[PDB]
Amino acid sequence: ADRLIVKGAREHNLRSVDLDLPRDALIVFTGLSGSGKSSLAFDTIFAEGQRRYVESLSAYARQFLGQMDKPDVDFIEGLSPAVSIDQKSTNRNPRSTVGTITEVYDYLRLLYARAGTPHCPTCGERVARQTPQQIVDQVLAMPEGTRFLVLAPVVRTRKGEFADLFDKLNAQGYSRVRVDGVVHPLTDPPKLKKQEKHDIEVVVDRLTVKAAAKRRLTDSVETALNLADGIVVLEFVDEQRFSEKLACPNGHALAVDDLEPRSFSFNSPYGACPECSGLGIRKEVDPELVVPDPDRTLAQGAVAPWSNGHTAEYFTRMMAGLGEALGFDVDTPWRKLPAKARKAILEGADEQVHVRYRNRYGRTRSYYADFEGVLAFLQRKMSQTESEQMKERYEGFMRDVPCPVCAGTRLKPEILAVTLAGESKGEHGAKSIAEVCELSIADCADFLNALTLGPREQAIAGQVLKEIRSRLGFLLDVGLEYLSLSRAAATLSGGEAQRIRLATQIGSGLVGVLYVLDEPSIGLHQRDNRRLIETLTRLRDLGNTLIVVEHDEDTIEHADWIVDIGPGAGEHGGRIVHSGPYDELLRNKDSITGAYLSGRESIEIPAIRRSVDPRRQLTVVGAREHNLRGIDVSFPLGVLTSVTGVSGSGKSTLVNDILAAVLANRLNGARQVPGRHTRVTGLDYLDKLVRVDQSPIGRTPRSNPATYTGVFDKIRTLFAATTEAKVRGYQPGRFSFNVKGGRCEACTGDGTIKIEMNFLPDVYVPCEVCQGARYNRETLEVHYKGKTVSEVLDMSIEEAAEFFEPIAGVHRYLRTLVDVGLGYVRLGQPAPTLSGGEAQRVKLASELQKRSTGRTVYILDEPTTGLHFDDIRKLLNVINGLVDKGNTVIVIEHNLDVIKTSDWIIDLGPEGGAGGGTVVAQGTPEDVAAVPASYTGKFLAEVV
Ligand SMILES: [Zn+2]
Ligand SMILES: [Zn+2]
Ligand SMILES: [Zn+2]
């Protein structure tokens, strides 16, 4: 058999399914959400693919593996080692960038280290080396009275164990050795791990720059230069480093010893920018809080940290308190008196101000304030003053910004001076990294370069240069041309992240692999779709075999074989509805998929659309943030708006970092940092903002649908207030798995335990003591309508909904969860196991569980995610419902149906990153399909 075969897969609601798949095909898994698609694809097939292979690695890791919950199948075979390509992790670590993620940056450092020449930062003369003598002369010329410790870094972070070395240093007695930070009396050194890299510097002298101490000055400096390989580092008291091999000709100091490849890593201290330490950024309070038009009243407030009841009454007073005392009152707009504004911001006059207050009873007749409560110090103060979430709440008046020293570049300047001489500029590695598009970098690295990669360096760095462009190549291929090497890894969308992984994997040149991909058409424009299907195929064609969980027409159309997964949701699914070619699937009358796919079903374009109100329009003005080009954009209120456009066009920066962040500030009063812009129009036409993020519901198995929606409180009471419970004296609290009495003590009531996996990813294994119940057995003695807590927590929501039809206080929450489509989800199903869409959808069911006051605004970022056709159809009703109450709903989408249904679309582009951040078209679908310049328009037009 050239076949992948599975018998009796039972992993979740999977009903002992058997499959006979064509290896060396692009297989696509398909069906309604919560069909079991993923349990089969990822939890069983892949999971086993990986496992069986890894078991080989070492007979040891074979044990470390033993402690996994091997997926529940009976027999599988024709199984290639598997590799997952989902969109699960968007790690927030600051230092890590595309460059780093793709290892491309790594190669860059080798390329720079070993070809292309360094320069001094100021004088700039090609950089020479330097004789111990004129290193003694530099230091002799120093400031008299300066005191510094001649220090010699014999070991610059290399690894070893240095017992022999410590002796040779007690051999001429030092007693002052710093290793790995901590200082050790060189009589008594520490034992070192030969395995860990190390940092051993001996103090050679504590000195001072007297004229005629020249003898010890000269006599120490030569010794350190000798003992630590020509490196002295004098570390002052009133540090500066000197290298034998790297020197400004004209005697400027250079703050970096070797030009070694690490010296480029803004992760190593050696290259990293000293100020921000290669973080690139500094959190730094903007003068931005404000609104220039409003000023100082309670109804008219100016200075944002100072707008309340007691806080507001208190500071307004003190402003005008100095405001006839500097002549600016409390009734001029912020953009009004230049002298006046610099006051509340800086320290200004610093003249005691008259503060009048009513005493504890009424007494009054006291007090001043030693200070104009200097505003930018209210900040430093209160960030310090109250330890809390509040601290981040105050942080909301600061803005990450590039570091002035390192220019944002996260780099020690001397490094920035190293230079690859190709065409217009021998741009720094960072100049190359910060290049606008992958193509921008590829062009210089790929062409502008080899053709002046000199005959010495072609021999020593030529291969490296090749390895780089190959890699840039594949990036273009996955259509990532538009981002830059230097972009932060965390910022990239799940799609973008995934699209990268695909570039890495496709390049890997691996054959015989089973790649299991999770919905890669996500966050990808309809345009780039047929492009990606190619890269997918060429991945198969290389000699691999794919399984793609998907609901996209084109991808499915293009599949070699299709498994359609049990019809219905949860219990109702988990069976192989279809498994065969595309045509054959169309024939299948039981495929909900086939229905839509054949045409028996569709989502129909509303014959009468919602009409837009010009007078009632929410408007972002002058959006400057990232690639947005100071645009003005108006979203019509009380209607369905899709923001569309290709990946990288600013869809997110607009709607999320600016449009949403403002509304959260102006309607729900979070103190959250909106992306740089001018302002937002009207806005008082709205009660509140609902941002249905796709972020996880919770990071712990503590968070549950029962918890999150808060139905569990209402159930814990239904339980405590029961015949069996009261006879035992059980309060509502015991039924809370969060709370010391009644929850199992081994899991602390989570039900499962996160067992660290080392090379493989960490995974939850059900607790042995509990079996994953959450509760100790005595607590489970208690029933309600013949079901314990664990049982009722285990119910599908759809199931629990019928079960609680009686208590309509609880039934409300459950109906909306069923309405939102999550019927199939288990009431107390650990939050970490929810798909970003499910999580999104749960949050959505929380606001549905509220009074729909006809002027609230909903922001749905890719709500289409992880949904089947039919699922979309259901969801759209939920949305029109919402909008028919006259609520405003704004949606970022690539999905055609959703777009073709919207009443208004805003199309950003034209391209991604640098090209883009403009409005390519806006109007009704009909209008936009009309704009020939619009990509969204192109596709939209085939449907309109
Ligand atoms: Zn210089
Ligand atoms: Zn910096
Ligand atoms: Zn337990």
Side-chain angles (χ1 to χ4, degrees):
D2 46 346
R3 306 205 66 86
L4 169 67
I5 284 137
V6 28
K7 312 271 200 201
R10 299 180 299 270
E11 253 302 320
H12 289 284
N13 53 0
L14 276 173
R15 300 299 181 90
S16 300
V17 297
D18 300 0
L19 300 177
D20 191 343
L21 305 193
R23 169 142 20 88
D24 289 296
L26 183 204
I27 308 185
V28 161
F29 278 17
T30 203
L32 300 177
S33 180
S35 190
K37 9 24 76 200
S38 134
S39 305
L40 218 213
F42 283 110
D43 296 301
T44 11
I45 302 175
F46 158 70
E48 273 262 4
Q50 182 173 254
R51 207 194 82 260
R52 298 199 184 175
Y53 175 76
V54 174
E55 277 165 42
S56 84
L57 284 187
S58 61
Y60 144 73
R62 176 180 197 88
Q63 320 309 345
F64 199 130
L65 254 169
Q67 77 207 55
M68 284 210 339
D69 247 44
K70 278 158 284 136
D72 201 0
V73 274
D74 281 319
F75 168 73
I76 84 211
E77 217 180 29
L79 225 209
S80 311
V83 166
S84 166
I85 304 176
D86 42 11
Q87 300 180 0
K88 179 60 60 180
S89 60
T90 61
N91 60 0
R92 298 300 180 180
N93 192 42
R95 4 204 85 222
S96 174
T97 78
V98 164
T100 78
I101 294 161
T102 53
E103 283 169 346
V104 180
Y105 190 84
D106 298 319
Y107 286 104
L108 249 350
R109 317 197 332 264
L110 268 107
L111 180 57
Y112 267 85
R114 87 220 289 197
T117 70
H119 295 235
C120 180
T122 60
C123 105
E125 299 300 0
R126 192 140 313 206
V127 145
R129 330 107 219 98
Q130 202 173 40
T131 89
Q133 178 58 349
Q134 45 177 3
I135 284 161
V136 100
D137 305 350
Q138 251 126 26
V139 41
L140 260 297
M142 266 158 83
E144 310 58 274
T146 60
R147 180 182 215 176
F148 49 79
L149 288 81
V150 166
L151 219 89
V154 297
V155 177
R156 313 166 73 205
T157 299
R158 330 289 182 13
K159 53 212 193 309
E161 158 268 5
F162 296 88
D164 299 0
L165 170 268
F166 293 122
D167 294 358
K168 201 149 171 162
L169 297 156
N170 246 336
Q172 339 94 148
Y174 286 83
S175 180
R176 296 286 293 172
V177 57
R178 256 189 254 116
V179 297
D180 299 0
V182 291
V183 218
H184 293 235
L186 209 164
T187 79
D188 222 41
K191 263 76 184 206
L192 288 180
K193 308 292 153 188
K194 195 146 85 231
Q195 304 95 49
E196 294 191 300
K197 15 258 282 86
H198 285 303
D199 278 312
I200 288 158
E201 331 103 50
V202 283
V203 213
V204 160
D205 215 296
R206 177 160 300 143
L207 247 161
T208 164
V209 183
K210 303 153 193 149
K214 147 158 186 272
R215 237 33 275 265
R216 299 300 137 129
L217 254 39
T218 302
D219 253 55
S220 291
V221 171
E222 287 163 345
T223 315
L225 276 210
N226 233 314
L227 155 267
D229 184 7
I231 318 280
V232 270
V233 20
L234 340 163
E235 136 184 23
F236 303 56
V237 75
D238 84 309
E239 66 135 70
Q240 151 138 34
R241 304 171 70 86
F242 301 86
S243 207
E244 279 199 38
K245 298 284 109 240
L246 212 82
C248 180
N250 302 52
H252 305 70
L254 302 177
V256 199
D257 344 28
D258 54 40
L259 293 178
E260 232 42 344
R262 75 190 162 186
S263 313
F264 296 92
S265 202
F266 58 93
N267 271 108
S268 220
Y270 298 90
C273 164
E275 187 87 36
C276 67
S277 78
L279 251 270
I281 264 171
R282 278 207 291 69
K283 205 171 304 189
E284 175 246 80
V285 45
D286 217 356
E288 59 65 11
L289 69 86
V290 52
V291 57
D293 300 0
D295 72 316
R296 346 305 280 283
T297 316
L298 326 172
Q300 186 173 355
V303 179
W306 290 345
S307 300
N308 192 31
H310 61 90
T311 300
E313 306 177 355
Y314 169 146
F315 281 88
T316 314
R317 195 157 305 153
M318 204 202 283
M319 316 234 48
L322 73 105
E324 18 83 300
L326 192 17
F328 62 74
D329 62 72
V330 134
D331 262 85
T332 60
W334 189 77
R335 190 222 302 276
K336 229 90 193 188
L337 298 56
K340 81 176 183 103
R342 181 180 180 180
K343 300 300 180 180
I345 303 180
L346 295 174
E347 301 179 0
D350 180 2
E351 60 180 0
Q352 60 180 0
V353 177
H354 207 303
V355 177
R356 299 181 180 180
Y357 70 90
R358 299 181 179 181
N359 194 38
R360 149 139 91 123
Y361 295 94
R363 306 300 325 175
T364 312
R365 268 152 193 191
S366 302
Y367 248 53
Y368 290 59
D370 337 273
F371 45 83
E372 104 99 24
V374 25
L375 165 53
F377 243 126
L378 164 85
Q379 307 296 23
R380 311 182 206 189
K381 271 171 211 148
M382 285 257 70
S383 300
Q384 181 60 0
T385 301
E386 177 129 297
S387 73
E388 197 55 5
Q389 106 228 294
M390 218 75 62
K391 185 186 140 212
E392 210 67 35
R393 146 86 57 167
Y394 293 115
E395 292 213 297
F397 291 113
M398 308 175 282
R399 209 179 258 295
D400 278 322
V401 268
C403 171
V405 231
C406 76
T409 90
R410 332 165 89 115
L411 282 196
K412 264 213 276 293
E414 280 83 21
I415 295 313
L416 299 153
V418 201
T419 260
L420 235 40
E423 179 60 0
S424 300
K425 300 180 180 180
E427 264 153 343
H428 181 90
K431 299 180 180 180
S432 180
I433 303 180
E435 299 300 0
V436 177
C437 300
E438 286 300 0
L439 180 177
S440 300
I441 303 180
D443 286 5
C444 180
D446 180 0
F447 301 90
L448 282 50
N449 218 21
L451 324 187
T452 152
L453 219 201
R456 341 168 137 214
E457 315 103 54
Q458 229 311 310
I460 203 172
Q463 188 71 6
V464 172
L465 184 58
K466 201 208 289 171
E467 189 73 53
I468 285 162
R469 15 163 108 134
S470 337
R471 253 168 248 250
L472 275 340
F474 303 127
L475 275 163
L476 309 156
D477 296 359
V478 293
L480 254 16
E481 107 288 342
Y482 64 94
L483 37 60
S484 121
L485 256 208
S486 69
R487 284 198 44 186
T491 61
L492 300 177
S493 96
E496 292 169 299
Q498 176 187 45
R499 257 184 278 339
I500 287 184
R501 186 165 176 68
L502 181 57
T504 311
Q505 299 300 0
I506 303 180
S508 67
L510 279 161
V511 161
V513 169
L514 168 45
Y515 290 88
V516 188
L517 295 87
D518 173 56
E519 201 172 4
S521 67
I522 294 169
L524 211 148
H525 189 266
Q526 180 68 340
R527 180 200 45 176
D528 313 301
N529 200 237
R530 220 267 294 94
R531 181 177 181 102
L532 147 98
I533 289 178
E534 264 151 57
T535 39
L536 277 195
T537 22
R538 78 191 36 109
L539 220 219
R540 180 205 43 195
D541 290 327
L542 251 43
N544 303 316
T545 132
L546 316 203
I547 283 168
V548 176
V549 191
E550 258 304 346
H551 328 266
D552 171 81
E553 202 218 34
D554 311 41
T555 313
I556 283 155
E557 285 179 346
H558 283 274
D560 282 334
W561 176 286
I562 293 164
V563 186
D564 201 64
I565 286 167
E571 35 165 327
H572 301 95
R575 277 165 253 271
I576 286 94
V577 156
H578 168 88
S579 165
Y582 173 90
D583 292 296
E584 197 201 314
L585 171 76
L586 295 166
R587 299 214 285 274
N588 203 138
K589 295 149 155 94
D590 298 69
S591 180
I592 309 74
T593 305
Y596 285 95
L597 254 167
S598 73
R600 256 96 46 49
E601 216 72 48
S602 73
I603 300 162
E604 228 37 281
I605 327 84
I608 30 165
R609 220 149 213 137
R610 286 179 182 79
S611 267
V612 176
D613 178 357
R615 249 200 90 217
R616 295 183 150 192
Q617 285 257 171
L618 184 50
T619 298
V620 183
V621 170
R624 282 251 67 95
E625 190 71 347
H626 310 127
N627 66 295
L628 304 178
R629 302 198 198 146
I631 33 166
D632 296 341
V633 184
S634 308
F635 308 92
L637 296 157
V639 89
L640 185 59
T641 307
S642 293
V643 177
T644 67
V646 304
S647 337
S649 50
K651 11 79 299 272
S652 180
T653 301
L654 185 76
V655 170
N656 294 348
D657 310 345
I658 303 180
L659 180 297
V662 162
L663 297 164
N665 300 332
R666 293 231 279 152
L667 291 183
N668 309 347
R671 267 174 267 159
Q672 152 188 318
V673 198
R676 268 232 210 162
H677 63 108
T678 288
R679 33 52 160 184
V680 197
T681 252
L683 161 315
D684 54 24
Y685 285 89
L686 300 173
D687 289 342
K688 89 269 191 63
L689 166 270
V690 186
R691 221 209 92 72
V692 187
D693 190 359
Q694 280 194 40
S695 57
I697 267 182
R699 224 138 75 166
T700 20
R702 281 301 228 287
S703 300
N704 289 284
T707 302
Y708 190 85
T709 348
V711 221
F712 202 40
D713 315 69
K714 298 193 166 203
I715 283 181
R716 296 197 313 274
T717 59
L718 259 177
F719 256 82
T722 200
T723 67
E724 312 198 336
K726 56 199 198 211
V727 305
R728 299 155 191 277
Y730 284 145
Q731 298 193 341
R734 176 108 146 155
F735 306 98
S736 170
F737 53 87
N738 269 68
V739 149
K740 180 180 60 180
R743 66 193 206 197
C744 165
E745 307 70 46
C747 27
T748 304
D750 300 1
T752 93
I753 290 169
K754 191 130 95 67
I755 182 60
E756 156 120 288
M757 228 73 209
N758 215 291
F759 22 124
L760 296 162
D762 310 28
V763 63
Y764 298 124
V765 177
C767 180
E768 300 180 0
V769 177
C770 55
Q771 226 69 355
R774 298 166 178 278
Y775 305 122
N776 59 76
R777 56 298 181 179
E778 295 302 320
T779 310
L780 298 151
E781 264 171 349
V782 189
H783 290 250
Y784 169 124
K785 276 202 192 91
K787 301 186 170 298
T788 191
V789 215
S790 222
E791 285 163 72
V792 68
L793 228 51
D794 263 296
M795 305 178 76
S796 82
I797 284 163
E798 177 233 22
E799 213 220 79
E802 181 60 0
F803 181 85
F804 284 97
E805 239 170 2
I807 309 82
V810 161
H811 181 101
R812 305 288 150 161
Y813 296 95
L814 300 195
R815 184 207 294 96
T816 80
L817 286 168
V818 176
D819 296 320
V820 145
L822 266 12
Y824 68 101
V825 188
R826 284 191 197 206
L827 237 186
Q829 191 192 310
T833 56
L834 266 29
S835 82
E838 287 158 334
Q840 201 204 20
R841 261 166 267 118
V842 161
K843 317 167 170 195
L844 202 269
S846 292
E847 262 65 13
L848 271 277
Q849 157 63 19
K850 261 135 205 164
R851 185 91 316 142
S852 64
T853 84
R855 42 189 197 83
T856 185
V857 81
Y858 292 95
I859 280 169
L860 297 171
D861 174 292
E862 280 215 73
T864 249
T865 280
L867 298 179
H868 175 284
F869 298 73
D870 193 88
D871 285 317
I872 314 293
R873 187 195 46 74
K874 291 280 178 203
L875 182 75
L876 277 175
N877 290 67
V878 188
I879 307 190
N880 299 119
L882 255 317
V883 183
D884 287 324
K885 319 288 148 61
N887 280 134
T888 304
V889 170
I890 298 162
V891 136
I892 301 155
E893 266 300 328
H894 302 278
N895 167 290
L896 277 189
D897 306 288
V898 171
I899 288 152
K900 86 191 186 157
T901 298
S902 343
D903 308 305
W904 193 253
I905 63 211
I906 299 174
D907 200 28
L908 274 38
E911 319 286 327
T918 60
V919 175
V920 171
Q922 77 215 84
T924 78
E926 280 73 32
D927 297 350
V928 163
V931 179
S934 164
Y935 283 120
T936 310
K938 246 122 142 306
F939 289 93
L940 207 37
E942 288 157 356
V943 195
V944 170

